[PDB]
Amino acid sequence: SLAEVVCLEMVDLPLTGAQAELEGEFLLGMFLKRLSSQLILLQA
Amino acid sequence: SLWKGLVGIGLFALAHAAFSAAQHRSYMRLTEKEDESLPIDIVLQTLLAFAVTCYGIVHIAGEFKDMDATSELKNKTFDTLRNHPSFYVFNHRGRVL
């Protein structure tokens, strides 16, 4: 069926876990959030 | 020597700030926002690290001294001055012992 193509597109792939939790990372709540995510990556 | 530990703590905290800011930058280039500034927390952290580190490095840098010669002559007497080591001679009472 690919012998007659009409229109197409190119899409970017999905994320790793790292970048997902990284987005999740982002007053004191800010600091502790940052710390927690850092410790998680560390343990990883 | 606590000031050494103080300086090492400033350095460690500063490095932590740099890491946090690099990963935040990655977030930025990833969400294609490229509009916002840095969170305050990072800024405060790095600045305090800088100030503390300077206050400690001033102490551990060394110690000043007077530029008046006779200050170091206050405690001195002939006994030191008189010896002249390059003119020593041993034909004296001590050789008895």
Swiss-Prot record, chain A:
It is found in: Endoplasmic reticulum membrane. Part of the endoplasmic reticulum membrane protein complex (EMC) that enables the energy-independent insertion into endoplasmic reticulum membranes of newly synthesized membrane proteins. Preferentially accommodates proteins with transmembrane domains that are weakly hydrophobic or contain destabilizing features such as charged and aromatic residues. Involved in the cotranslational insertion of multi-pass membrane proteins in which stop-transfer membrane-anchor sequences become ER membrane spanning helices. Belongs to the EMC1 family. Component of the ER membrane protein complex (EMC). It is linked to Cerebellar atrophy, visual impairment, and psychomotor retardation: An autosomal recessive, neurodegenerative disorder characterized by developmental delay, intellectual disability, hypotonia, scoliosis, cerebellar atrophy, and variable dysmorphic features. This is ER membrane protein complex subunit 1. It comes from Homo sapiens (Human). The gene is EMC1.
UniProtKB/Swiss-Prot annotation, chain B:
The chain crosses the membrane at residues 1-19, 41-60. Keywords: Endoplasmic reticulum, Endosome, Golgi apparatus, Magnesium, Membrane, Phosphoprotein, Transmembrane, Transmembrane helix, Transport. Residues 20-40 are lumenal. It is a multi-pass membrane protein. One of its GO terms (cellular component) is early endosome membrane. It is found in: Endoplasmic reticulum membrane; Golgi apparatus membrane; Early endosome membrane. GO terms for biological process: copper ion transport; magnesium ion transport; protein insertion into ER membrane by stop-transfer membrane-anchor sequence; tail-anchored membrane protein insertion into ER membrane. GO terms for molecular function: cobalt ion transmembrane transporter activity; ferrous iron transmembrane transporter activity; inorganic cation transmembrane transporter activity; magnesium ion transmembrane transporter activity. It comes from the Eukaryota. Component of the ER membrane protein complex (EMC). Belongs to the membrane magnesium transporter (TC 1.A.67) family. Part of the endoplasmic reticulum membrane protein complex (EMC) that enables the energy-independent insertion into endoplasmic reticulum membranes of newly synthesized membrane proteins. Preferentially accommodates proteins with transmembrane domains that are weakly hydrophobic or contain destabilizing features such as charged and aromatic residues. Involved in the cotranslational insertion of multi-pass membrane proteins in which stop-transfer membrane-anchor sequences become ER membrane spanning helices. This is ER membrane protein complex subunit 5. It comes from Homo sapiens (Human). The lineage of its organism: Eukaryota, Metazoa, Chordata, Craniata, Vertebrata. The chain holds residues 4 to 100 of 131 of the full protein.
